[PDB]
Amino acid sequence: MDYRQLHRWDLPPEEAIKVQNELRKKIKLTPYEGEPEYVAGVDLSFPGKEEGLAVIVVLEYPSFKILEVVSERGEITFPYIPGLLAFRQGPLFLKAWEKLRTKPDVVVFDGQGLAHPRKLGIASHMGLFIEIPTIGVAKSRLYGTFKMPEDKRCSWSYLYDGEEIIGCVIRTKEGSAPIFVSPGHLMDVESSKRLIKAFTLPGRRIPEPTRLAHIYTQRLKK
Ligand SMILES: [Mg+2]
Ligand SMILES: [Mg+2]
């Protein structure tokens, strides 16, 4: 698939932060109504060290049948810094994205989108590059305040930055920790909540797109 190279990747962390502040102006939080036909999930691994692995899985919806898997291996050159995940994982994702032949209607990332100190998590940032609706689904909080939802399945709370809503916290699985859902690009809070709920099977904590991407991350270990 094609994409837009909006800036260079070889940046020190200070310049990388400045780049996020310019890009946040381009995000469009628009509703995503209706149901998607194809849904991509994205996951990364770091087998041993000095060899990253990016996996993209494309599924049919609502069946969740797997239509395509692509993978890319490459060197990781930028440290993990919370809030700068895209600068570590973005380049390898985009090399995998180039090989993708099936165009997804929505792409789900393992990480935040809007629920980010500069409103531009990896889901939002990659959404600007690929120009497809995106959602970030994270297993822990990076940014924002909330009250813990009830322990019943499908209970949920909004994630806040002051007065503004930046995502939601969903108890997808009773007796498990909730997930943190936020829109990326071409996505809003209500639609990302509706879609991740429809992507999550009963009895499972993680939505099918990123759960299956994570599974291939482990099965495609070199
Ligand atoms: Mg952690
Ligand atoms: Mg994973």
Swiss-Prot record:
Effect after changing residue 105 to A: No effect on cleavage of DNA containing inosine
A GO BP entry: DNA repair
Named cofactor requirement(s): Mg(2+)
Protein EC: 3.1.21.7
InterPro entries: Endonuclease-V, Endonuclease_V-like
Major place of residence: cytoplasm
Cysteine pairings via disulfide bonds: none
UniProt-annotated binding residues for Mg(2+): 43, 110
Annotated Gene Ontology cellular component terms: cytoplasm
Record's keyword terms, sorted: Cytoplasm, DNA damage, DNA repair, Endonuclease, Hydrolase, Magnesium, Metal-binding, Nuclease
GO molecular function: deoxyribonuclease V activity; magnesium ion binding; RNA endonuclease activity, producing 5'-phosphomonoesters; single-stranded RNA binding
Top-level EC class: hydrolase
Chain residue ranges for the region called Interaction with target DNA: 139-141, 214-221
Catalysis: reaction(s): Endonucleolytic cleavage at apurinic or apyrimidinic sites to products with a 5'-phosphate
Compartmental location: Cytoplasm
Site positions per UniProt: Interaction with target DNA: 80
NCBIfam families registered for this protein in UniProt: endonuc_V_Ttgales
Protein family according to the UniProt entry: Belongs to the endonuclease V family.
Function in brief: DNA repair enzyme involved in the repair of deaminated bases. Selectively cleaves double-stranded DNA at the second phosphodiester bond 3' to a deoxyinosine leaving behind the intact lesion on the nicked DNA. In vitro, can also cleave single-stranded substrates with inosine, double-stranded DNA with apurinic sites, or DNA sites with uracil or a mismatched base. When present in molar excess, two protein molecules can bind to the same DNA substrate and effect cleavage of both strands (in vitro).
Protein name per its UniProtKB record: Endonuclease V
Source species of the chain: Thermotoga maritima (strain ATCC 43589 / DSM 3109 / JCM 10099 / NBRC 100826 / MSB8)
